[PDB]
């Protein structure tokens, strides 16, 4: 997260870190057994890390739980990143309260302020990986401005959120992570051209399109 701020411990209880030796993606706990993340975050042997603030320091109260299944969307396109959504099932249920974030019943509209979080890079120019979870308040941007920012690259399963002006964005390391607006997980950190660049906002997976599939996938796994 570039241009953001320190969330505070436990303030983003549904934020998980996906770890395969090092933190590499975020995810959102959506119930005690399941995490949503980006499908490009797919790895074998994911360990999900819950109740993290400082990813680098084991406070002693975190939960490190292995992914038992990692289910990419079967329309996930690694080339376009369309349907960049993945459901991770926890080997054992997480101990709650850590908390899940609600899935949307409606899509969010342009203008909706959201909370984006992660331990991704905090710098546009250099690299600055944080230890504590970083947060960014950012509004969903209009579709037409998303698409003009990224011509030919934006599908109906994507939205842009952030600032066209630059300076405030998600970044590498934030992938899979939540965009939560009005108490609903609306976005997953997916991609963008660099980070916090002028006219290159973050592009997120439009979670609302996947609520039926998430439900079908959870019910049948």
């Amino acid at each position: 997260i570039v241009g953001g701020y320190t969330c505070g411990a436990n303030t983003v209880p549904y934020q998980v870190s996906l770890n395969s030796g090092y933190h590499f993606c975020g995810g959102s706990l959506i119930n005690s057994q399941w995490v949503v993340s980006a499908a490009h975050c797919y790895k074998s042997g994911i360990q999900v890390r819950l109740g993290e603030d400082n990813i680098n320091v084991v406070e002693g109260n975190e939960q490190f739980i292995s992914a038992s299944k990692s289910i990419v969307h079967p329309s996930y396109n690694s080339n376009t990143l369309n349907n960049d959504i993945m459901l991770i099932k926890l080997k054992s249920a997480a101990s709650l309260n850590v908390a899940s974030i609600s899935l949307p019943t409606s899509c969010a509209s342009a203008g909706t302020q959201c909370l984006i979080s992660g331990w991704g890079n905090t710098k546009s120019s250099g690299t600055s990986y944080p230890d504590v979870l970083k947060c960014l308040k950012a509004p969903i941007l209009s579709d037409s401005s998303c698409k003009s920012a990224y011509p030919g690259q934006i599908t109906s399963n994507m939205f842009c959120a952030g600032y066209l002006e630059g300076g405030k964005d998600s970044c590498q390391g934030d992938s899979g992570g939540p965009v939560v607006c009005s108490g609903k997980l609306q976005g997953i950190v997916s991609w963008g051209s660099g980070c916090a660049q002028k006219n290159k906002p973050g592009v997120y997976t439009k979670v609302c399109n996947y609520v039926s599939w998430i439900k079908q996938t959870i019910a049948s796994n």
Binding site: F24, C25, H40, L81, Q153, C171, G173, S175, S190, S193
Partner: protein, 46 residues
């Protein structure tokens, strides 16, 4: 482009810079370093 997924998969460039993922490496190559190549996975040694 140069549009990259926002996954962290630190790699090491032939320029001795650590890139956040193969893709951002790929972008730096495409932006100003044609001979830029991935040497190995993980951060470069400084």
């Amino acid at each position: 482009d140069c549009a990259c997924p926002r996954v962290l998969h630190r790699v090491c460039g032939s320029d001795g810079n650590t890139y956040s993922n193969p893709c951002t490496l790929d972008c730096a190559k495409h932006e100003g370093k044609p001979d830029l190549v991935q040497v190995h996975e993980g951060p470069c040694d400084p």
